[PDB]
Design a protein around this ligand. Structure first.
Ligand code: CLA
Ligand code: CLA
Ligand code: CLA
Ligand code: CLA
Ligand code: CLA
Ligand code: CLA
Ligand code: CLA
Ligand code: CLA
Ligand code: CLA
Ligand SMILES: CCCCCCCCCCCCCCCC(=O)OC[C@H](COP(=O)(O)OC[C@@H](O)CO)OC(=O)CCCCCCCCCCCCCCC
Lengths: 31, 86, 152, 80, 737, 41, 160
């Protein structure tokens, strides 16, 4: 199939970047 | 903090002349260190832009010439400037 | 035949081990003159190897399938010399040592500075106490009966 | 800031207040010992948690006790 | 200037342990007292604050050291005369393995007396004493017996001198602070005269006897050394120039001595070592140079230099007052001198280890592979240990003897005022070297595992050529006839001349090529050395104060921590920086010795046939296999450990036993390194409880080891286990092949 | 000498003498009766 | 006697020193003219210059050392990788700017020169200034990568 050519980069490069950016913004937040 | 070298450009000419004068004596089997370096420079320009090979004698002459030249320049600066502080 | 073992004297692998060891020793002797000292040493080694194998054969040990002696420690009377008698001897000796140490420690406990008698031993008192441990079982048992063995 | 507490087994030796590397501890008058003194701990916001005071106390178990707690810029010894 | 009978000779102090310290002399309340007794035994500074007493104590201990060394030499010479096969080896050096130790047959340990040739059974030695004795002209065991007797006499003399110069006539402080006279005497007399005497011995003894031996003469038919002195006709037959006597020397006709004073270079084809005439000329020239150099410093006659005057005149626009004040520091502190001398001696030992393998100075030494490997490794380890000790004592000086109010120095003050920049730059350099040296090995491993050999850093895919070292090799190979006209051959065969020297069917030395693997391993060496220098220099520079603990100098040189505060302060003392640098020194030296062993076995050592084809021990696999960590694990550690693990039942079984014993000792150290004191003190409390129950509780209360003692035990056991394992592995591998 | 006798009673010297004598006795015992695996008497 | 090293601005109690490396007139002139130190210019224009310079450089290593260096697709793959790295760096700059700066606050840059003269604090240390800088940097980096690829693989210039 062609699905692994999409989901492997999606889980290895895109989702980690989004999660790390969101988590850094969360931990750096103050009020 | 400015003019930290106490600029005196007479050192450049004096050091260059005081290196070129003794180094021009042909005590090396009829040849001089400056002469050997200049002939090596001339030989390596015949195949421009190809660089000198690892087995060429150019590098040895370059290093040995610049060692003495730098020694003359440094000692000239120290002597010229040290006359007024001691 | 305990655990399917066989006596050493009937074991063929035991003899093969002996033959291999002797043959290995004999190949080194051919490199030296018979009168030289190394030849004498190798002769003594060969004789000692033969004597050791004969003695192991005589004592009634048990061999496995590899031709190596095995020890039985279950308490059978036919193999009491393997574990029981050396164990009793060791227990006697260890009790002697411990009793002598305890007696010396108790002897110097009443002094002004008992610590200084531990780094610099009082030789005559220890020498007098050394002989007393030869009868340690009787003294220890009587002390246990009198209740002086355990600190109150 | 850390927590520094004093108990009434104190003998008034002064050795804890001489040992502190920041001014946290001081002597106050008292009654209950021969020396007529006891240690006090008014400035525990300046405590670094070194326990030099507890190494100096001669009581069987310490008459001064330090309990490590929330850490701040002063209590971490940061000069950044 | 001495004092007559300063201290009475008596046995009274022998019966009062800890007399040197007020605290220790009280008595053993706990077991910590016993450990405190041994740790402070030789710290003479803590005993008394008088410099004269410390100097007098220091002077006498060196006599005891010399006595112990002389006893060791006497034993070494005696064992060669009585329990060796030296005389059989002297007739056939290439087929007989040297041996000088024999074992009593007790519990079956006579198996260690394996054959070595010459009708002898013993333990093969790898110290190289046989070659030393052969190069000196020694032929019979009578001479060795005489040498052992003389060494024993000298040991007795040293012991008597040590007693005398402390109990009968102890020099004053003014005698010790005469550095000009000491330097003059140690240069002109100790070194120059020793070199001249050795040159004379080589001229009159070693040259004729070694010529006779090289000619093929039976050692029992060679004339005795004194016959060459009483009979000048024999020397004239060997060397015609001896017929003219010393007349050419005094008429400046020195060219007549060219027969036995040469400048050949290279190796002797018969023996595979350096020419002895070159060695004699070298020692003569060195003696002249040291004799001249010993007339530099001023003494009672006014001519010469003053060291203080030289120091005071060296200052610059960047350094302020310069070296002014360094003369007073180095004449009042024993620790700074010790640190400087330790560093220099360690560097010299490493240089000696590097030099002795490429220019083999002894006959039949290059073809004895085990001796070469052992000497290299031994001297590398000694140099590393001395270098670490240098930093330790520098930190001790910084903590104790630093006093700017009376001993100000501008150069030391300026270093302490910018230490942050130095430490940060060294940190960055270490990180850069670690990334760009070890990372290339991980890249190679990943590319090889993924099936992409064309993307590796190697001689076939991506070359990293060390062009600077190759240029130096080319310059040194072409030196004779261009820049060294007086030389006949190059200084070493490794420069790449192209010639091969073979002795008895084995390869002695030949050119050593450099490629991609050498680049990587050299940068690994640089990285490890830089990290070690970081840990030691940080430890020295921050000994007195830091931003974390401003008052660190008041706590001393050897303290465990300053408590759990400031986030935690474990390992802040200067002692802990030496404790941590020992581990990195071990790492660096292990890597260096592994590199040496594999490179030698792969590219140099081997056997030569009749047709002239060389078969190396491992077949030249270093170039392609060492570029990966898997290669080091497989082709070096796995393959070459088969000799040591198969040694049971043979004469090499002692190495097999030591392998496992050292493994156990190394693993045993991790208990002290990973755990802390409180657990063990709590555990002892329960054990003491049952001893109280049976009335066997000691009056000396048991205590757990201190924090520093536990750290020291751990590091000592760690180093012992690792070094012993490597030692057994190397010896078992190299004796068999 | 009383002080010399005191130095001979210190722990390390006494332990060394005791262990040397013990090792000698054990070595001679194993020399007279080698390879003992069982107590035959 | 003449001495070269002096304390920073004459104050010996501030943790720095003045050396020829830090205070040489040539070095001082060179650093003052870089875009990162032009405090009186629109941050967008400095960001565009920084992006252009940094994007132009990145093409070389990716092109020459990449997994497809020995194939006909070397240049395109290298340029695409450089563009991806530029995108990642732009994301990092945006995230840093969001985390560090709050809307409506004044600048936190120093407002004193080395000679004691009062100056307007840099506007790069504000949310708006950093956003402009990041948007200039992204546009500059993409433009530099495209220019490098164009020069290397659309014009057959005699390089190397
Ligand atoms: C905890 C359970 C679990 C685990 C360990 C994995 C692990 C994996 N899945 Mg996966 N998967 C799971 C549940 C799980 N899956 C479920 C419940 C579904 C839906 C039916 C899928 C559908 C799925 C697809 C369609 C693909 C993978 C693939 C993969 C592999 C690559 C990682 C990836 O792309 O993630 C993707 C993970 C998900 C989409 C799961 C979301 C929930 C990896 C071995 C890829 C593969 O085979 O690579 C070779 C691939 O193409 N998975
Ligand atoms: C300091 C270095 C040194 C070292 C490490 C050794 C080590 C050794 N010597 Mg030795 N020896 C030395 C110096 C040394 N010696 C000196 C200076 C002399 C006098 C010149 C001797 C004279 C000597 C003799 C005469 C003998 C040894 C023997 C031995 C071996 C057995 C030792 C023994 O059983 O003692 C036991 C312990 C005692 C205290 C006694 C052992 C390998 C013996 C040997 O090799 O037997 C085959 C032996 O017979 N040595
Ligand atoms: C300190 C070292 C030393 C000592 C004690 C001697 C001692 C001696 N040398 Mg001598 N020598 C030495 C170094 C030394 N030499 C060196 C370094 C050279 C090389 C230049 C020579 C070259 C030399 C020659 C050429 C001769 C001596 C001779 C002699 C002897 C007569 C004088 C005497 C035993 C003479 C000799 O053998 O007569 C018996 C003789 O002819 N020596
Ligand atoms: C010429 C060389 C030299 C000299 C004269 C000294 C002299 C000194 N050093 Mg020193 N040192 C040196 C080299 C030297 N060092 C080197 C090379 C290192 C680096 C490893 C060190 C590291 C070092 C440290 C870390 C310390 C010293 C200290 C000292 C001082 C006290 C030493 C003491 O009490 O020893 C006591 C001696 C011992 C406890 C013996 C140790 C035994 C070793 C570790 C194990 C041997 C194993 C053995 C084979 C097993 C057999 C055991 C047997 C019972 C069966 C003293 C002035 C101390 C100091 O000044 O404190 C303020 C200190 O803390 N040194
Ligand atoms: C094998 C274990 C190991 C490793 C890897 C290290 C590594 C390091 N030690 Mg170290 N150390 C160790 C054991 C180890 N030590 C032990 C047992 C001790 C004794 C207690 C010490 C004691 C010690 C001291 C005292 C010091 C160090 C320091 C250092 C660092 C040196 C500077 C540098 O950049 O090096 C190069 C770094 C490496 C080789 C590690 C990187 C590994 C490769 C390159 C993989 C890279 C992956 C890459 C980044 C992508 C990953 C991304 C991820 C998503 C997968 C380095 C990180 C020093 C320090 O702090 O720095 C100066 C220092 O002062 N160590
Ligand atoms: C820069 C590197 C270098 C080094 C380390 C040496 C080293 C040496 N040269 Mg030398 N030399 C050099 C460059 C160098 N040379 C150059 C560039 C030339 C000119 C081509 C010479 C020409 C030269 C001559 C003519 C002689 C030496 C000789 C020597 C040796 C003795 C010289 C001395 O004073 O003692 C010594 C090993 C002498 C010699 O052969 O000693 C055995 C000698 O006669 N050299
Ligand atoms: C005469 C001395 C003596 C005596 C009677 C005992 C008796 C005992 N010890 Mg013990 N012990 C001793 C010395 C002694 N210990 C020493 C010196 C140490 C430090 C090495 C220990 C360390 C120790 C531990 C760690 C433990 C015991 C335990 C025990 C109990 C279990 C039985 C046993 O054998 O344990 C085994 C005992 C040992 C292996 C100790 C080694 C034997 C030493 C070498 C004997 C030394 C004798 C001494 C030199 C006497 C000199 C006499 C002379 C002056 C005349 C038992 C009550 C165990 C217990 O029940 O916990 C409470 C336990 O866990 N002991
Ligand atoms: C080479 C000659 C030689 C000979 C023939 C002996 C013979 C003997 N030694 Mg001996 N010994 C020797 C050299 C020698 N030794 C040397 C050089 C040393 C080192 C200094 C020793 C140290 C030594 C010790 C320490 C001991 C012996 C003992 C013994 C005896 C063991 C038998 C036994 O226990 O029965 C009982 C003893 C006898 C029947 C007669 C004694 C035996 C008679 C042991 C001994 O005497 O046991 C009591 C013993 O403990 N020896
Ligand atoms: C608790 C462990 C333990 C035990 C029970 C034994 C028991 C024994 N060992 Mg032994 N041994 C041990 C540990 C032990 N060993 C260790 C750790 C070593 C290494 C140092 C040795 C090294 C050793 C040797 C070298 C010899 C023995 C021998 C013997 C036997 C002694 C014969 C005799 O009369 O005395 C006996 C069965 C002797 C024997 O012949 O056994 C058959 C013998 O020659 N042992
Ligand atoms: C920088 C160039 C090397 C250094 C150099 O020019 O050496 C020479 C330079 C000037 O020395 P001076 O002439 O001031 O002093 C000469 C000394 O003999 C006086 O003790 O040294 C320094 O300024 C300190 C360098 C520290 C180390 C700097 C980093 C490396």
């Amino acid at each position: 199939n062609n699905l692994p050519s999409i989901f492997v980069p999606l889980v290895g490069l895109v989702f980690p970047a989004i999660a790390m950016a969101s988590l850094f913004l969360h931990i750096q937040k103050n009020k | 903090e400015r003019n930290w070298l106490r600029r005196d450009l007479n050192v450049v000419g004096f050091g260059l002349i005081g290196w070129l004068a003794p180094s021009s004596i042909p005590a090396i089997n009829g040849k001089s260190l400056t002469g050997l370096f200049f002939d090596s420079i001339g030989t390596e320009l015949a195949h421009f832009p190809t660089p000198p090979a690892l087995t060429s004698q150019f590098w040895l002459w370059l290093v040995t010439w610049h060692l003495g030249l730098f020694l003359c320049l440094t000692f000239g600066q120290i002597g010229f400037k040290g006359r007024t502080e001691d | 035949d305990i655990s399917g073992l066989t006596p050493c004297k009937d074991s063929k692998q035991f003899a093969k081990r002996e033959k291999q060891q002797i043959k290995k020793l004999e190949s080194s002797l051919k490199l030296y003159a018979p009168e030289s000292a190394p030849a004498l040493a190798l002769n003594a080694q060969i004789e000692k190897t033969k004597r050791r194998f004969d003695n192991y054969g005589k004592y009634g040990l048990l061999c496995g399938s590899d031709g190596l002696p095995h020890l039985i420690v279950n308490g059978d009377q036919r193999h009491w010399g393997e574990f029981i008698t050396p164990g009793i001897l060791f227990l006697y000796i260890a009790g002697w040592i411990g009793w002598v140490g305890r007696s010396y420690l108790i002897a110097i406990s009443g002094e002004k500075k008992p610590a200084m008698k531990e780094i610099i031993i009082d030789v005559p008192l220890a020498s007098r106490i050394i002989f007393r441990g030869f009868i340690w079982p009787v003294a220890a048992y009587r002390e246990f009966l009198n209740g002086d063995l355990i600190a109150k | 800031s850390h927590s520094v507490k004093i108990y009434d087994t104190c003998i008034g030796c002064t050795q804890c207040v001489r040992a502190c590397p920041t001014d946290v501890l001081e002597m106050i008058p008292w009654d209950g010992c021969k020396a007529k003194q006891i240690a006090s701990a008014p400035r525990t916001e300046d405590c670094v948690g070194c326990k030099r005071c507890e190494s100096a106390c001669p009581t069987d178990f310490l008459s001064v006790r330090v309990y490590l707690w929330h850490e701040t810029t002063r209590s971490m010894g940061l000069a950044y | 200037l001495v004092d007559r009978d300063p201290i009475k000779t008596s046995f009274e102090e022998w019966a009062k342990p800890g007399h040197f310290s007020r605290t220790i002399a009280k008595g053993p309340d706990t077991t910590t007292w016993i450990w405190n007794l041994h740790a402070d035994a030789h710290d003479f500074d803590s005993h008394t604050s008088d410099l004269e007493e410390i100097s007098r104590k220091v002077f006498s201990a060196h006599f005891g050291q010399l006595s112990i060394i002389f006893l060791w030499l006497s034993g070494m010479y005696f064992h060669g005369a009585r329990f060796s096969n030296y005389e059989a080896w002297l007739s056939d050096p290439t087929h007989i393995g040297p041996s000088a130790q024999v074992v009593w047959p007790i519990v079956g340990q006579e198996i260690l007396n394996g054959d070595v040739g010459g009708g002898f059974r013993g333990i093969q030695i790898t110290s190289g004493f046989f070659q030393i004795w052969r190069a000196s002209g020694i032929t019979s065991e009578l001479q060795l017996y005489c040498t052992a007797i003389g060494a024993l006499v000298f040991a007795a003399l040293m012991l008597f001198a040590g007693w005398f110069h402390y109990h009968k006539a102890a020099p004053k402080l003014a005698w010790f602070q005469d550095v000009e006279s000491m330097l003059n005497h140690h240069l002109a007399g100790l070194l120059g005269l020793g070199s001249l005497s050795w040159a004379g011995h080589q001229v009159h003894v070693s040259l004729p006897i070694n010529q006779f031996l090289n000619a093929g003469v039976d050692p029992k038919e060679i004339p005795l050394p004194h016959e060459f002195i009483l009979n000048r006709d024999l020397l004239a037959q060997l060397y015609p120039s001896f017929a003219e006597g010393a007349t050419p020397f005094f008429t400046l006709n020195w060219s007549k001595y060219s027969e036995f004073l040469t400048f050949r270079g290279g190796l002797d084809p018969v023996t595979g070592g350096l020419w002895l005439t070159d060695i004699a000329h070298h020692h003569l020239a060195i003696a002249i140079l040291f004799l001249i150099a010993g007339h530099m410093y001023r003494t009672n006659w006014g001519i010469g230099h003053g060291i203080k005057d030289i120091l005071e005149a060296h200052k610059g626009p960047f350094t302020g007052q310069g070296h002014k004040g360094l003369y007073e520091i180095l004449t009042t502190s024993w620790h700074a001198q010790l640190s400087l001398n330790l560093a220099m001696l360690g560097s010299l030992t490493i240089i000696v280890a590097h030099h002795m393998y490429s220019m083999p100075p002894y006959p039949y030494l290059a073809t004895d592979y085990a001796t070469q490997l052992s000497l290299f490794t031994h001297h590398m380890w000694i140099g590393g240990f001395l270098i670490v000790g240098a930093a330790a004592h520098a930190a001790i000086f910084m903590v104790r003897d630093y006093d700017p109010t009376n001993r100000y120095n501008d150069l030391l003050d300026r270093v302490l005022r910018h230490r942050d920049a130095i430490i940060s730059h060294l940190n960055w350099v270490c990180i850069f070297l670690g990334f760009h040296s070890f990372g290339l090995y991980i890249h190679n491993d990943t590319m090889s595992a993924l099936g992409r050999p064309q993307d590796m850093f190697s001689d076939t895919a991506i070359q990293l050529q060390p062009v600077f070292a190759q240029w130096i090799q080319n310059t040194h190979a072409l030196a004779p006839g261009v820049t060294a006209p007086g030389e006949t051959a190059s200084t070493s065969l490794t420069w790449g001349g192209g010639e091969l020297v073979a002795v008895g069917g084995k390869v002695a030395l030949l050119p050593i090529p450099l490629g991609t693997a050498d680049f990587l391993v050299h940068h690994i060496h640089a990285f490890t050395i830089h990290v070690t220098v970081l840990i030691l220099l940080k430890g020295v520079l921050f000994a007195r104060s830091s931003r974390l603990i401003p008052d660190k100098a008041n706590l001393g040189f050897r303290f465990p921590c300053d408590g759990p505060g400031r986030g935690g302060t474990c390992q802040v003392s200067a002692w802990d920086h030496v404790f941590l640098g020992l581990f990195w020194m071990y790492n660096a030296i292990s890597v260096v010795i592994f590199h040496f062993s594999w490179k030698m076995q792969s590219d140099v050592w081997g056997s030569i046939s009749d047709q002239g084809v060389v078969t190396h021990i491992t077949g030249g696999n270093f170039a392609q296999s060492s570029i990966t960590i898997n290669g080091w694990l497989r082709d070096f550690l796995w393959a070459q450990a088969s000799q040591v693990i198969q040694s049971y039942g043979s004469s090499l079984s002692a190495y097999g036993l030591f392998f496992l014993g050292a493994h156990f000792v190394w693993a045993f150290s991790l208990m002290f390194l990973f755990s802390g004191r409180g657990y063990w003190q709590e555990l002892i409390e329960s054990i003491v409880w049952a001893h109280n129950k049976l009335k066997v509780a000691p009056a000396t209360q048991p205590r757990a080891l201190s924090i520093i003692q536990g750290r020291a035990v751990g590091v000592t056991h760690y180093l012992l286990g690792g070094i012993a394992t490597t030692w057994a592995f190397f010896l078992a591998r190299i004796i068999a092949v | 000498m009383r002080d010399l006798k005191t130095y001979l009673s210190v722990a390390p010297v006494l332990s060394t003498l005791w262990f040397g004598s013990l090792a000698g006795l054990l070595i001679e015992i194993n020399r007279l009766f080698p390879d003992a695996l069982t107590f035959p008497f | 006697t003449f001495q070269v090293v002096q304390p920073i601005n004459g104050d010996p109690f501030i943790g720095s020193l003045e050396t020829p490396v830090t205070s040489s007139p040539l070095i001082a002139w060179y650093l003052s003219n870089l875009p990162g130190y032009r405090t009186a210019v629109n941050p967008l224009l400095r960001g565009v210059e920084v992006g252009l310079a940094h994007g132009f450089f990145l093409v070389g290593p990716f092109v020459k050392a990449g997994p497809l260096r020995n194939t006909a697709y070397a240049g395109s793959a290298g340029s695409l990788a450089a563009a991806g790295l530029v995108v990642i760096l732009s994301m990092c700059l945006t995230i840093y700017g969001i985390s560090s700066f709050k809307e409506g606050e004044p600048s936190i840059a120093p407002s004193l020169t080395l000679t004691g003269r009062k100056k307007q604090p840099d506007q790069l240390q504000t949310a708006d200034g950093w956003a402009k800088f990041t948007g200039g940097f992204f546009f500059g980096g993409i433009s530099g990568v495209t220019w490098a690829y164009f020069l290397l693989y659309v014009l057959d210039l005699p390089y190397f």
